[PDB]
Design a protein around this ligand. Structure first.
Ligand SMILES: *[C@@H]1O[C@H](CO)[C@@H](O)[C@H](O)[C@H]1NC(C)=O
Ligand SMILES: *[C@@H]1O[C@H](CO)[C@@H](O)[C@H](O)[C@H]1NC(C)=O
Ligand SMILES: *[C@@H]1O[C@H](CO)[C@@H](O)[C@H](O)[C@H]1NC(C)=O
Ligand SMILES: *[C@@H]1O[C@H](CO)[C@@H](O)[C@H](O)[C@H]1NC(C)=O
Ligand SMILES: *[C@@H]1O[C@H](CO)[C@@H](O)[C@H](O)[C@H]1NC(C)=O
Lengths: 340, 336, 343, 344, 340
């Protein structure tokens, strides 16, 4: 009878207790864990965190769960049976909040093989934490870290290892709202050392590169259009003061609005970001155009060859400013696209 | 007889009382009398189309298996400790139009249990439910919302459980005050719905329908004094001499831009709906009036390039107040 | 006695244990499940998720719950009895987070028939997730998904199937706050494959299209008003320079701040949306009007015979700009209403 | 002899004590004397009409079933986990939007049983109480927020609540509010709520709160003073500078409108008018009247023999408006500071 | 002896040890030595006056009932679930708005019993502490937030807390704050709170936090300097050329009043006046004073012998405003960097 078999295996009549690890006071019991990412996203720069949804899996061997009644090896058990067997401690080192998932039942899997190997996969939702470097914001590449670590036992009893083949796999059809996922994911050892003792640890790296497709349209194109519009004043004659003062204040006001929005869209940071550099340079160029207007107006109104000097300086400015803008633009783009 | 012996022999695992079987099993359906005491009311988030109440739900029925001893002449009231509430049969009851409801428990559990002489059992619990009602915003500043609350049964069909309101004054409330709404203590008309689910069967449900009418005391000021002042300021441009040609245009442009800013700002509070609200109608009409003032200035300027211009200006200055008064009269007549 | 009947069926003396599925190591037990949408809404673009309120129902047959004491077949039991019988595992794959409803009791139903069939309906509240495309944001059509999938058992033990008739039914009078719900609901099979095994799965599709009334009133009308305001400056005489420059400045400022406000309330996406195109064209037209005023001022101040040129260019611009706006309007509306979508 | 044996004999399995029966059953109602201790305060949000507290609620009562004689000492301290085995009085806060216990590394509870049967039971709690407010004079308002204690399970025939004779409500030393001030006096009274199910005991404590105007003064009154002072500049400007006066009036009206709209966006919707609303409306009315006066003077001037009239009306306005504004200022401030509002 | 039998005899059903009675029942008080480990730190918000930590709280105490002799080894590790059967000292944090354990894939607790009876008990926690702040000089303020560990159930006569002798508070290497900086010294005081019910022990730790100027400088102060320089530019221009000066006044005023609006919004409402408020008010006053000076110059010029007066007052203003602004800046910076 299957109920009698279950009772004899792990029930009260079995004599098996879950308060003792396998091969107590001997070699450390090793666990080979691999995950399966089901979802991703919600990467927020303000809080420096992201949410995953993983089917964490673990495997270990104990000699106390060996059976011979059933010839079949891969035996499936109910999720509710997991409360009566030993389970290795495992907590994520860097996480702000995590919780199980239970709808219409608990989300757990249990499977016992003939030789004693046990498979235990549990669904989880995590909110991990990864500090980010925003030195070059619109063209940054992030590496967010997920760490697995034992808590109850030292390295003398519990050891974690990745699976040799396909340790981390991504669900098909997954896409990120604003980032990209690299096809390679680094795996390393951490082995954190605390005051109490030596605890095992396990780390997996995710490489994310931001796509500037939105930032182009939102900021760079309007800035280019505004700074190009600012140059129309040079071709306008100096006597048309209302026209030039019209093509004045407007571009600096628009640049101020763009700078305010771009700077207010991001979290606080000590250093200066690339978008800040671009916005500052464009604002300075608009200010320089207005200052050139003021200088031409001041020289022209020097109450006899003065008009010729004003024409010469206006022509020089109209011929020089595009070259300066082009050289700044090419230098900025090449450095932040190659040498960054 | 020990004091605890009454509760021990009346209902416990020792006695033959099974809380898994309804009273009058395979017989007459159980009748439940329900009345509600409203404790708090408010937090009517128009953006999420939900409101939060705080009630003292009460429900009594008849359980023949719970009869007090005949010799025990200890009055009808037999207040039982709330802990023993889990050892007797209870009727299922869930709020159909509910989004999030939870009990309250501080220093104890908020549940009161009564057992009367003949067997009637009274249960009163303190709940904090967050009901939902689909708002109608056809005339937003002066609407009359109709938000309801429908109790229901889940486990048993109409053949076993049936809900009936209290005979006299079922819904009670003591001086409830709201920030933006006024709830009538008399218009609490209620009926019963007995919803039918295909594939399972009939299920009893009783509902209470309130009547909330928004009071236009804040919207009136905040969205009709500035607009009226802007319209009058736009009218002020007519008496300025047309030879200025540089000061009348700022008045019109300021009027239209201020009205546009007001219209854009005032739409953030309300939820997104397809139809057109009365406030939007008023804002659009005011913006159109300002734009008409500016275009009439443009027409005067065109005609000036001055007797004809002066005649046009005088005609417009005479015409605009009468047309605006006519519009205001018809608008406030439609949305009285 | 009914209590003795319950004890013999699944009680202490029954011998039944809820730890073994029906037909152990035999044919896989099939489950026919159907839902009943009781609420809908909160479809938010900034998070790409939506909330439902379903009466999930499951039906299956096990031979160990067959009774003969009661002549009647349809027997109703307490919700608290569900923990003493075997139940199939079922989790929603694309779920951000869901919780039961426990108010005054557990919201559960149980019904055991004579032949052993079991009905188990439980009230839930799901915050599902559906990725969206915003190629044409104000006039898009979205398809959000709900997936049912087994976790504990492979396809060799548990199989899910939709009901033959009325698989998904919607409560009458349901209204969406902004969207519209179609009468067609596709039913497919997913049957997800993992390395552990081949898990059964079940899918359902909801079709939603967006209503443009709110977006129209809130954004398209003010943009038209602002561009007409910009055009008004054409007929003002060029001598009154301050009057025209004030309009040229204020219209540009209003247009750019309105564009920023309109675009600040949407998720950041790589592609370009329809509202972005409309805002860009409106801003470009306002800028072109200001530039035309600058040009007509420049021409007039060259210095007799030039005022005629300024007047002719101003008249040509005033007669030409509205036609360009109208042709752009008809082109954009037809291309985004006929061929691009709803095709 | 052993403490475990004593505990089991007092309230254990062999004790015969059942936690489902109140002391002296079917007799006089058991009296419970309670006092609180405020550990934190603040988070007074007007948009939701609530405030958060953090109290060490303490309850004292006597039951004859917990009298001991083995231990000579009178005061005895027990584990917090023992509180699930003895009778406790029901107590809930009527005006509560939500409250939760505090558990960290253990439950936060205290138990103390005296020789004669008196029991002390102090439990840590965090409450979010609700108090309606009147905003007739918003920047100079005085608010009274209420905390209520009430029995639920038992009527006044079984349970009676009373305040402590001395030190009923205690405040932690150095407690500060972010914006308000807490008065020394705290009123205590009875409520004794009556329902149709019976007569329930109740207990009420009042806190007196008065707002500080230091922030609101700087944020609102100073810019309004600057705006109204700059409005008077128009009168002294010559009529020939008509566009300058028009622009100054328009920008002053714009600033007043923006400030008035911003002021009301930080407060919950209310039907009646507030003091800040009156101030903003009157300042806006003064600016609008100044602009209208300028427009009327300009209309008069553009109709010799009239320029003198325009000058005299402009001078009369320039001499009368500051006086009227100062009179209104003193009248409004004295009426909203001394008699018509505040001052108890 | 099977380990299960040993665990049963030590603190199991047949042991006779009950967790309901503290060691040395009404004898000498039991002393507890506690030390912590900050795993994560941050989320300092002025709008709520709170901050979040993530600590590995550790406690040590001695009881004679948990002394064993069967196992020769001294450091014996037990399961986290075994912690529900031993006496644990009460410990609640006095100043905290909300705390919760971490329970992912198991309970996050540790237990270790030595031979002599010493017990180690480390439990992971996440806390949202509370510390009121002083914003007299907001951009350059120094904050000291307080974490308190206090006993609740027992008086001073039974439970006594005290910090570990050596290295009581240790911080994980590489920890960084989003906006603040951590001092290398941390005070360790005593509270010893007195209540109505009795005398309760307490333990206090001080963290010194100092805000950085890296963000605020670039975001606010430098643009104000550029705006004031732009305002000064107009004075050096000839007076007759009105339009250039009008444009330089309008753009300056508009940009400064656009920038000054958002600075005060993010911070909570307070009675006192902050440094950023003073700086913004003074800069706005200088810009308005420049505009009023230009207006007065135009008014004077609109009245031979007068043009000399107009030009001398214009050059006096142009030579005086830089001196006033520089003396204001030196006074402000020196006072708020030395005296305050
Ligand atoms: C588990 O892996 C460790 C790794 O060092 C090894 O020493 C040990 O023998 C393995 N297995 C067992 C059952 O201890
Ligand atoms: C509920 O309405 C149904 C309508 O079929 C009716 O049969 C039933 O008696 C009603 N119950 C009450 C209490 O009104
Ligand atoms: C359930 O459906 C499956 C579908 O293949 C079928 O094989 C099976 O026999 C059915 N019934 C049972 C009781 O297993
Ligand atoms: C408690 O106080 C009440 C107050 O009236 C009194 O009647 C009663 O006797 C007191 N004591 C007991 C044990 O009931
Ligand atoms: C713990 O330390 C205190 C410090 O005063 C001491 O009195 C006491 O004896 C120590 N140990 C025990 C087991 O009581």
């Amino acid at each position: 009878s299957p109920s009698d078999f279950l009772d004899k295996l792990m029930g009260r009549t079995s004599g098996y207790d879950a308060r003792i690890r396998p091969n107590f006071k001997g070699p450390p019991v090793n666990v080979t864990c691999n995950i399966f990412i089901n979802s991703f996203g919600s990467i927020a720069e303000t809080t420096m965190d992201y949410r995953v949804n993983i089917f964490l899996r673990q495997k270990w061997n104990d000699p106390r769960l060996a059976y011979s009644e059933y010839p079949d090896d891969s035996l499936d058990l109910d999720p509710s049976m997991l409360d009566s067997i030993w389970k290795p401690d495992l907590f994520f080192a860097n996480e702000k909040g995590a919780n199980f998932h239970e709808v219409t039942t608990d989300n757990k899997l249990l499977r016992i093989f003939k030789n004693g190997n046990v498979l235990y996969s549990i669904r989880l939702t995590l909110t991990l934490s990864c500090p980010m470097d925003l030195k070059n914001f619109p063209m940054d590449v992030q590496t967010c870290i997920m760490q697995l670590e034992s808590f109850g036992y030292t390295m003398n009893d519990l050891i974690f290892e990745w699976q040799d083949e396909a340790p981390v796999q991504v669900a098909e059809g997954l896409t990120l709202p604003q980032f990209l996922l690299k096809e390679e994911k680094d795996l390393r050892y951490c082995t954190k050392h605390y005051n109490t003792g030596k605890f095992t640890c396990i780390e997996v790296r995710f490489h994310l590169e931001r796509q500037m497709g939105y930032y182009l349209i939102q900021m760079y194109i309007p800035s280019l259009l505004i700074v190009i519009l600012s140059w129309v004043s040079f071709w306008i004659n100096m006597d048309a003061a209302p026209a030039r003062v019209a093509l004045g204040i407007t571009t600096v006001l628009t640049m101020t609005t763009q700078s305010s929005g771009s700077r207010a869209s991001l979290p606080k940071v000590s250093y200066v970001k690339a978008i800040d550099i671009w916005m500052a340079v464009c604002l300075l160029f608009v200010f320089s155009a207005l200052l050139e207007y003021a200088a031409v107006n001041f020289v022209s109104r020097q109450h006899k060859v003065f008009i010729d000097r004003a024409k010469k300086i206006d022509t020089i400015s109209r011929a020089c400013f595009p070259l300066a803008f082009l050289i700044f633009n090419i230098f900025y783009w090449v450095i932040y696209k190659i040498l960054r | 007889v020990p004091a605890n012996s009454t509760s021990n022999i009346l209902n416990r695992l020792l006695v033959s009382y099974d809380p898994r079987i309804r009273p009058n099993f395979k017989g007459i359906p159980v009748d439940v009398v329900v009345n509600i005491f409203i404790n708090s009311f408010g937090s009517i988030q128009e953006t999420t189309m939900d409101y939060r109440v705080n009630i003292f739900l009460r429900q009594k029925w008849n359980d023949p298996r719970l009869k007090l001893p005949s010799d025990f002449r200890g009055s009808d009231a037999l207040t039982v400790d709330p802990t023993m509430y889990k050892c007797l049969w209870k009727p299922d009851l869930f709020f159909a139009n509910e989004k999030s409801a939870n009990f309250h428990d501080v220093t104890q559990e908020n549940i009161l249990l009564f057992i009367f002489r003949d067997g009637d059992v009274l249960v009163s619990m303190r709940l904090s439910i967050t009901l939902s009602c689909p708002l109608d915003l056809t005339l937003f500043p002066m609407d009359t919302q109709r938000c309801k609350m429908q109790l229901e049964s889940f486990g048993y069909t109409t053949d076993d459980l049936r809900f009936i309101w209290q005979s006299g004054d079922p819904v009670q409330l003591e001086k409830i005050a709201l920030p933006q709404f006024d709830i009538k203590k008399e218009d609490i008309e209620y009926g019963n719905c007995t919803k039918y689910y295909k594939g399972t069967g009939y299920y009893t449900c009783v509902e209470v329908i309130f009547t909330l009418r928004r009071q236009v005391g804040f919207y009136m000021m905040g969205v009709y004094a500035p607009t009226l002042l802007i319209v009058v300021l736009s009218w002020l441009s007519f008496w300025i001499n047309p030879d200025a040609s540089a000061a009348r245009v700022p008045l019109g442009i300021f009027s239209v831009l201020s009205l546009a800013s007001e219209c854009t700002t005032l739409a953030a509070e309300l939820p997104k709906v397809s139809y057109v609200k009365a406030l939007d109608v008023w804002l659009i009409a005011c913006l159109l009036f300002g734009f008409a003032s500016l275009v009439e200035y443009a027409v005067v300027q065109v005609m000036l390039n001055p007797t004809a211009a002066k005649r046009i200006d005088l005609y417009a200055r005479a015409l605009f107040p009468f047309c605006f008064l006519f519009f205001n009269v018809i608008y406030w007549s439609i949305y009285l």
